[PDB]
Amino acid sequence: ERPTLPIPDLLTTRIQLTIGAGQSTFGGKTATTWGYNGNLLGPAVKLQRGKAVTVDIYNQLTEETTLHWHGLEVPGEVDGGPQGIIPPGGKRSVTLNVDQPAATCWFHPHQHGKTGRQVAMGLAGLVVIEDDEILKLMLPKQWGIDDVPVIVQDKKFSADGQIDYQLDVMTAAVGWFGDTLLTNGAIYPQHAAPRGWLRLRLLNGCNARSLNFATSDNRPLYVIASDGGLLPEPVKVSELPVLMGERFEVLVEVNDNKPFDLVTLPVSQMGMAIAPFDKPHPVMRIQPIAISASGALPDTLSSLPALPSLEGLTVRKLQLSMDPILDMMGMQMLMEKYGDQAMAGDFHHANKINGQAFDMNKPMFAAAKGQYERWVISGVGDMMLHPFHIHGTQFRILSENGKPPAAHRAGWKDTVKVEGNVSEVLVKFNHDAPKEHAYMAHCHLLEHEDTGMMLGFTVKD
Ligand SMILES: [Ca+2]
């Protein structure tokens, strides 16, 4: 027997999110965990393009927190920038006026120095943006039945059953990773899927572990959407790498009564091919049921504007770097504890952008509003994986780590891979972020961000 896959409540849209500590059980041991309106994770907030909703956020924890609307094209005031800290027992109200295509976004704490720990404790929620366009496509759309969110996260636990989180020299170097895989908070759950097409909204919500999705019988995954929404057409893939914080929506066929698994395949990332992730690892069991769903795989999904002329656009260079000491010690501890499988394929300001660890009150530059810019992000100089996330925008990747992006990564993205080479993205910011509410750009390997690999920037007309 497997647990049934939990489905976050879809909150149709004033909304309250109460941030609080509860309890969860994993393999018969109880752990203190944190959730939005629950023990763990959070709801799926449903937003309609062009309609405003106010979100009341109440912090019932005993420590400060913040909330990042990951993927939303909103003013910097929504996250709050440096003015976004919600004290224990405090509250903050924001207004979300969505003006972007349909997409699956998400939200999560984002306080510098504490983001890894607060996500590890359980905090994460979803944002389902809908528009007029996507509803004409007749995709699978019955939430929790044939339209299913899949939030995949690893954790590790102490002997006493508690979540075993630490920001130490080793995790500052390679990230916090564990040996237990959760799917919407459950270990290897099952989902009962109607015959036809099954839509999976995939979110890599790990602190540091990259994932690579596939099916146990290697049937195709039809990618229909990236971080920022629909592709122009479905893209058939046999495997789907997903970086930390990225989302993809895929359709998979359910065409007989035999169960199969969604799995994740071993990645070439420091520390992440350690057992039990040295082999394909099940994510969830898909059990077909003898009732039809009528959702379709459309031949065409959407229209993607042409990349504009790069002639005359501002080019901003961002160099990612890691203190050489941190690299050395952290590497040595990883090798000492886990051996060769770890390579299969002060430290609190040691990770930097442009030679600077994040300074919350000094934005690095002012970006133009409503103008395309080319941002060049280099990881030359270290071998670590850095998924690079830019707030306030959905951008287009021009070069992903020294190569043009894969077709299913060539649409709307808020994250780009950087791993030893150079990426280039085309960004435009439609909304204001003054100094007091600055946007951020940062590595989404959370322990890197927490140890300085983040910058602030403003946006003004
Ligand atoms: Ca509901």
Numbering used by the authors: 30 to 42, 47 to 378, 403 to 518
Quoted passage from the original study:
CueO plays an important role in copper homeostasis by oxidation of toxic cuprous ions to cupric ions. As with all multi-copper oxidases, it contains four copper atoms distributed within one type 1 (T1)2 copper site and a trinuclear cluster comprising the T2 and T3 copper sites. A distinguishing feature of CueO is a partially structured 45-amino acid segment (residues 356–404) capping the entrance to the T1/sCu copper-binding sites. The goal of the current study was to engineer the highly compliant MRS such that CueO activity would be modulated by engagement of a partner protein with a scaffolded peptide.
A panel of CueO variants was generated with differing modifications in the MRS. These included insertion of the parental MDM2-binding peptide sequence present in the N-terminal domain of p53 along with a higher-affinity derivative (peptide 12.1) into the MRS α5 helix to generate CueO-p53 and CueO-12.1-α5, respectively. The results showed interaction with MDM2 only for the CueO-12.1 variant, where the 12.1 peptide replaced residues 384–394 in the intrinsically disordered region of the MRS. Kinetics data indicated that insertions into the MRS primarily affected kcat for syringaldazine oxidation, with no marked influence on affinity. This was most pronounced for the 12.1 and PM2 peptide insertions, reducing kcat ∼2.2- and 2.8-fold, respectively. To gain further mechanistic insights, we determined crystal structures of both the free and MDM2(6–125)-bound forms of CueO-PM2 along with CueO-12.1. However, in the highly similar structures of CueO-PM2 and CueO-12.1 (Cα RMSD = 0.22 Å), the MRS-PM2/12.1 regions were not resolved.
